[PDB]
């Protein structure tokens, strides 16, 4: 809103406050008027020679608690003055992250709470919190360093706190990735060089090694915010780039078949290659590490046309017009039988695989995927069907067979595209399980 | 051995300063422990004490200058051994695990940058490792320093005293503490648990027990999956934790390649492929939404044909209304996206707040606009695998979720 920023920090060591604002660019912040913070002596709201804040908990022993009464005048004592936006901190609260720091920047008036020793009686808490907020996942002896720490993180967020030196808009976190790495002169020290790029490299040069270095640590670094972060197309691909030929402790396959498969009947036919199939398994296969998706079709004609497909998007305009479509397409092997796919595999592993094949029926002795990281130790083919689905042949030449994929009552007709996809998920969730 | 701390800033007496208050300062003056400021301008040749000059590769950001830190080490290095660290954004998350491993040093030397950063190459010479105070940006080091400290010290045997014990704290025990009061027995109309004023210590400690699982159920569920949890612990979860849905497939308003917002046509197959998913899990009903009176008509032409449930529809208003309608209550819109955003939730965290009939949207195109995701009720956290590509059809990311509903509640 229109008001000076103004941060009141209730606390029985105010002139700590007051001493660690005057060093750095926030304490320039504060001399020009850009923002204030008003350290609040907790004691002063106090009627006892001893100015007394605390006492022995219930519940036994001698731990002391800050008591409700001074620090509810205290707050009380601010909202008779302006309106104010109320936090305990507390490691109970929300994990203070970048984002909570944006969010705490609207408002004009943040009033924080410092506990000491054990805390801070719950009553005046739950009586006059606004909301609750935890420096870290780890407990420190008062709630001051939290304090001036989020005042901080929250101030250098006004515009013209900070100038040239240190911009706040591409910064870690704030950008939802670990930053690049920074060098100033000179150019050698004790031998190691600052990377030449950014000695005598272009604008664009620069920005693709930082860009890069940037995605390279924070994949490195914290791996749970790349998945977090929603990557632009650019990003996409450097990430595809720093990730490729990374080998899991599993080596799963793919294939879809189209002989033999059943008819109405149960006669023995082969099916066309549906386009959507290769479009949408590959993506699926891609999504989940499937190390190749193999489409097998004995027609030569059939081959054909499918490879013209994958072509298309590899190496012709496909390749630029969909960027991930080619990407998923890069592990797509059209190849004409079962026999094929288990050499390739073999040449791939250096061990044949296990065979796994997929029905909406029941079979005997069918598995569930839990089986799976068991004996994961070697590469899984997964088999998936066309038309009216694999003959018992394929079904008994397999070592398994998966159970069925059920959701409620007997209807369990789905796509091939979406048993795949199913089945990949199951698998995913287990194996990180 | 006295713990001590080195810390290098080129704001040594901060550090002094905040070390004079509290439990800590009491810690410091019988010698439990000792904090050490090292002024980083010491360790300069000019006459202006320059410890950062300006960046390469374009700017007038400022960074700190190798030479400084790497002679400021260097000298502590030449009195005693010392763990090194460099307090950067881009090292371990600070933890109670962390302070746990750091008690185990004797000497501890924190290296405080200031404006962009610190000359990389000094920390790859000389740090032992990098720590981050946490998922935050600060405007230095000395903050991030001290609280570390803060944490280790009054780990220290003798620091804290009966005033506060550090052997059962939030963090410290993988859960989040119960709730602390003290006198008077009755404020402002509330009441202390009466439990704690005449209760047995047995009944005191379960109730401790219990609010402490309760709040981390609560506040920190990612805590709880990570606990091992005691047999009690496991039984007092159990005591604390012991659904019609719709399907819409929205062609407006999308993304197109560019970001822009657009009307999808109807893709024939997401007809067809959508409907069996939407069957075989029980979804009662799936709404094709379209606000093109033409794309309509397709559509509806496409499910006459493709039988030789389903409802074609308008706008999402329509779908609600209908629902409505068929319900008698309003539904829980939830979207769904491959992008992650804040406050999307898990399909496990939809079991437990879903009270009311469920609708699920679905895009098509690039994608549902910001506008929608803002406005649903919650976002389902994107499908991930492999963690590095999530560029799944609508075809898939419904059976995928409607799969994990279904198996949430086997
Ligand atoms: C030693 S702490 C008491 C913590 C409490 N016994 C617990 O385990 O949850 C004393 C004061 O320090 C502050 N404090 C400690 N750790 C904090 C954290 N992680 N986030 C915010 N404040 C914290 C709080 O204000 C608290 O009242
Ligand atoms: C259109 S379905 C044919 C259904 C046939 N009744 C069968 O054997 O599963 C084509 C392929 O999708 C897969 N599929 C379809 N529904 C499935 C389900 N409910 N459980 C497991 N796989 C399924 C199988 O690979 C099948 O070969
Ligand atoms: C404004 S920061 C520079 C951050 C860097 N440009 C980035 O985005 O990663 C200046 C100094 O403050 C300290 N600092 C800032 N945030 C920190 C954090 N989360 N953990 C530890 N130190 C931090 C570091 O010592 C850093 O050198
Ligand atoms: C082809 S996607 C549109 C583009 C998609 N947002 C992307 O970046 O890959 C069509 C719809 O499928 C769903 N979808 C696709 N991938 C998803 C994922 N990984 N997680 C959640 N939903 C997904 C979303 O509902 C999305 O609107
Ligand atoms: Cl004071
Ligand atoms: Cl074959
Ligand atoms: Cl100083
Ligand atoms: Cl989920
Ligand atoms: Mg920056
Ligand atoms: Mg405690």
Not at 90 to 113: C, H, M, S, W
């Amino acid at each position: 809103g229109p008001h000076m920023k103004r941060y009141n920090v209730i606390t029985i060591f105010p002139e700590m406050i007051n001493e660690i604002f005057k060093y750095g660019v926030l304490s320039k912040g504060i001399d020009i008027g850009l923002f204030r913070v008003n350290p609040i002596n907790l004691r002063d709201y106090t009627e006892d020679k001893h100015k007394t804040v605390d006492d022995y908990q219930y519940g036994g022993g001698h731990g002391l608690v800050m008591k409700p009464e001074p620090i509810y005048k205290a707050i009380a004592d601010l909202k008779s003055k302006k309106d104010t936006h109320v936090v305990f901190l507390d490691p109970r609260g929300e994990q203070f992250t970048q984002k909570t720091a944006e969010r705490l920047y609207n408002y004009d008036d943040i009033t924080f709470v410092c506990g000491r020793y054990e805390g801070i009686d719950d009553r005046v808490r739950e009586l006059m919190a606004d909301e609750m907020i935890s420096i870290g996942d780890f407990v420190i002896t008062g709630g001051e360093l939290a304090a001036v720490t989020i005042i901080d993180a929250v101030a250098r967020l006004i515009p013209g706190v900070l100038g040239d030196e240190n911009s706040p808009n591409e910064e870690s976190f704030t950008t939802g990735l670990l930053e690049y790495p920074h060098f100033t002169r000179p150019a050698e020290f004790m031998g190691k060089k600052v990377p030449e790029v950014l000695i005598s490299g272009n604008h664009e040069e620069i920005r693709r090694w930082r860009l890069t270095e940037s995605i390279k640590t924070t994949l490195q670094n914290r791996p749970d915010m790349i998945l977090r972060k929603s990557l632009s197309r650019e990003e996409e691909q450097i990430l595809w780039s720093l990730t490729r030929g990374v080998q899991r402790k599993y080596n799963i396959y793919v294939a879809l078949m189209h002989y033999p498969m059943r008819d109405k009947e149960g006669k023995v036919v082969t099916t066309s290659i549906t386009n959507m199939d290769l479009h949408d398994i590959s993506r699926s296969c891609r999504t989940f590490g499937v190390k190749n998706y193999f489409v097998v079709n004995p027609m030569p004609a059939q081959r054909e046309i499918a490879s013209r497909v994958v072509r298309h998007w590899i190496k012709g305009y496909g390749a630029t017009y969909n960027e991930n479509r080619k990407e998923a397409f890069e592990y797509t092997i059209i190849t004409d039988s079962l026999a094929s796919v288990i050499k390739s595999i073999e040449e791939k592993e250096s061990g044949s695989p296990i065979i796994i094949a997929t029905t909406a029926r029941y079979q005997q002795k069918a598995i569930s995927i839990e089986k799976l990281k068991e004996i994961a130790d070697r590469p899984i083919l997964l088999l998936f069907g066309t038309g009216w689905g694999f003959v018992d042949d394929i079904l008994e030449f397999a070592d398994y067979v998966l159970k069925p994929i059920h959701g409620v009552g007997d209807f369990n007709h789905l796509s091939v595209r979406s048993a795949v996809a199913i089945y990949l998920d199951r698998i995913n969730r287990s194996f990180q399980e």
